[PDB]
Every structure is written in structure tokens, then in C-alpha cells.
């Protein structure tokens, strides 16, 4: 565990718990800068771990 900050796992766990969240909510609740959060989400998305929702931005877990 380098540092004391955002873990992609942390983002995963958080979403697993809340079901869905706005990226801004994640940035606040996890105390991690927004650009870092945005990049982490996209990475997990490309991996097919999280999914982006059109409704503005809802992020949740699965393919």
C-alpha cells in the first residue's frame, strides 16, 4: 500500500456498497482529486469492471 489514498479497490468497494455514485461524490467521499478519480474510473471501465450510465454520470459495477 503506497501512500494513504485512493485505491482502485477502494473505488470498487465504495461502488459495491452504494450501488451507483457520481464521480464528484467519489472524489469527496474518498478525498481524492477529481482528475485522478476520472482517470481511475475510465481505467476500470476499459477493464470492464465498472459501467458508465447515461440518465448525468452514474458509475456502477459490471461489464
Amino acid at each position: 500500500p503506497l501512500g494513504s489514498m485512493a485505491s482502485l479497490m477502494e473505488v470498487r468497494d465504495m461502488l459495491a456498497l452504494q450501488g451507483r455514485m457520481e464521480a464528484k461524490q467519489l472524489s469527496a467521499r474518498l478525498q481524492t482529486p477529481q482528475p485522478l478519480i476520472d482517470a481511475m474510473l475510465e481505467r476500470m471501465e476499459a477493464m470492464g469492471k465498472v459501467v458508465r450510465i447515461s440518465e448525468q454520470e452514474w458509475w456502477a459495477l459490471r461489464l
Partner: protein
């Protein structure tokens, strides 16, 4: 006197513009052997070398989880055809751009980062970033096309990146990655075998194919971790974003 340089970066990072600035009219278009994707190549001179510049398709990473880009770039990098790489990075989006950068530097191929959109960007301590990466970082203000000479100078001088341990991965993953690396042919350099091992655990479909005698050993690797790590791939990507965060914090 000949030097082959690969040009790689995220999509929409100014890679094509930089490609034009370095080659001008000396460009030839074709295709990547065996596929339909275009392969563009160019020529130019430095004050030591006659450079052949191979454009690699825009890519966010070297991981292939239907885009051929990550695959083409990864396959080309692994082939050893290029003596060095020019990694084009958007200074206003280091959090996204450095994932590819880290993958290249970990792999160990000599690099020179061409730092772009420095005006569109936040303030970056270029020298600190160079220090954190272990390779040169040449600023470019493309709209004006300056720094091209500094970039050329770097190509003639840079020989090997600083030997740094850039990312901290969980011990179990390194353990298994080395187990995998021991099953790969000895024609693949040690450092690249370890890298391929981690790429396999990360879910890279290609690195797995490229690893031949280990492709079918990943299931037992995952089982060996079933005891310790829940999602291997998420841990490898997470580990890399840990240092991206550290670097971004230290230089921006």
C-alpha cells in the same frame, strides 16, 4: 548511423501533429502486416542520426482486454525493431496519459517524453517529472513547433533510462509473475518476461499469446492467489495508479 524510433501516445494527444513536424513530406503509408490498420512511417535527420520514425496507433494502454491499437503497439514494442521511443504526453491530462508511460518505462525500452499542450495546461516541474520517470522530458509548444531541436538532441544522447523501481505491487503478484516468467522462452529478456507475467495477471490477451509457454499456466497462477488476492488485475492497475498519483502530486 541509422536509428529507428517509435512514436506512441494516447489518442488526441498531438501525436499526428508531432509526426508531421518531424518528417514533413518524407512519409510513407502502408499497413501493419496481416491487418487492415494503416501503418505510417517517416524519415528525418538529427545531428548524429538518420531516423526512421514509425507511428504507432493512438492508445490508452498496452493492455488488450474491438481495438487492435493496444495490440499493435504492444506487439511492435516487444519486437525490438525500435531502438527507442518518443512517448507523446498531454501535460493537461497526466492522470490519464501516464498509465501508458508507466507501462513503457517498466518494460524498459529507452524513452523520451515529448510533453505537449503545455499551454492548454496547471504548472508542471519538468525536471522533477524527468527525475520521477528516469527518462528525459522535452517540452513542446506545438502550435509554434518549438522544442523539436531539443527533442532531436535527446534522441542522439539518450541511451538507457534510469534504472528505477517505479511501481509497488503486492508480493504475491510479483511471486506469481516470476513463476510465469520462468516458463517463458529465454529469447525474451529477463526484464520483459517479468513484465509479460504482470500483463497476463492484468488480463492482457496479447501478452498471454506472446508468452507462449505460460499462456496455459495463468489459471493455476490465479488459483495460487485465490488464497491471497481477490482481483489480481485490479491490483496491478491500482498499483500503477498509486505511483501516477504520487508523481502527479510531486510535479503538479
Amino acid at each position: 548511423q541509422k536509428l529507428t524510433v517509435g512514436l506512441i501516445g494516447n489518442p488526441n494527444s498531438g501525436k499526428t501533429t508531432l509526426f508531421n513536424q518531424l518528417t514533413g513530406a518524407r512519409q510513407r503509408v502502408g499497413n501493419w502486416a496481416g491487418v487492415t490498420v494503416e501503418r505510417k512511417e517517416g524519415i528525418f535527420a538529427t545531428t548524429d542520426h538518420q531516423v526512421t520514425l514509425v507511428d504507432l496507433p493512438g492508445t490508452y494502454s498496452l493492455t488488450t482486454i474491438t481495438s487492435l491499437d493496444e495490440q499493435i503497439a504492444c506487439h511492435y514494442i516487444l519486437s525490438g525493431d525500435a531502438d527507442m521511443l518518443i512517448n507523446v504526453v498531454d501535460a493537461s491530462n497526466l492522470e490519464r496519459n501516464l498509465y501508458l508511460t508507466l507501462q513503457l518505462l517498466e518494460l524498459g525500452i529507452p524513452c523520451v517524453v515529448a510533453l505537449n499542450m503545455l499551454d492548454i495546461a496547471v504548472r508542471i516541474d519538468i525536471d522533477a517529472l524527468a527525475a520521477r520517470l528516469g527518462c528525459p522530458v522535452i517540452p513542446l509548444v506545438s502550435t509554434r513547433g518549438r522544442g523539436i531541436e531539443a527533442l532531436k538532441i535527446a534522441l542522439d544522447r539518450h541511451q538507457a533510462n534510469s534504472d528505477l523501481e517505479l511501481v509497488h505491487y503486492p508480493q504475491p503478484l510479483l511471486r506469481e509473475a516470476d513463476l510465469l516468467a520462468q516458463q517463458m522462452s529465454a529469447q525474451i529478456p529477463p526484464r520483459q518476461r517479468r513484465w509479460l507475467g504482470l500483463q497476463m495477471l492484468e488480463g492482457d490477451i496479447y501478452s498471454r499469446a506472446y508468452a507462449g509457454d505460460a499462456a496455459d499456466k495463468l489459471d493455476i497462477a490465479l488459483a495460487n492467489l485465490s488464497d491471497e488476492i481477490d482481483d489480481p488485475a485490479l491490483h496491478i492497475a491500482d498499483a500503477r495508479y498509486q505511483t501516477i498519483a504520487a508523481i502527479c502530486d510531486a510535479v503538479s
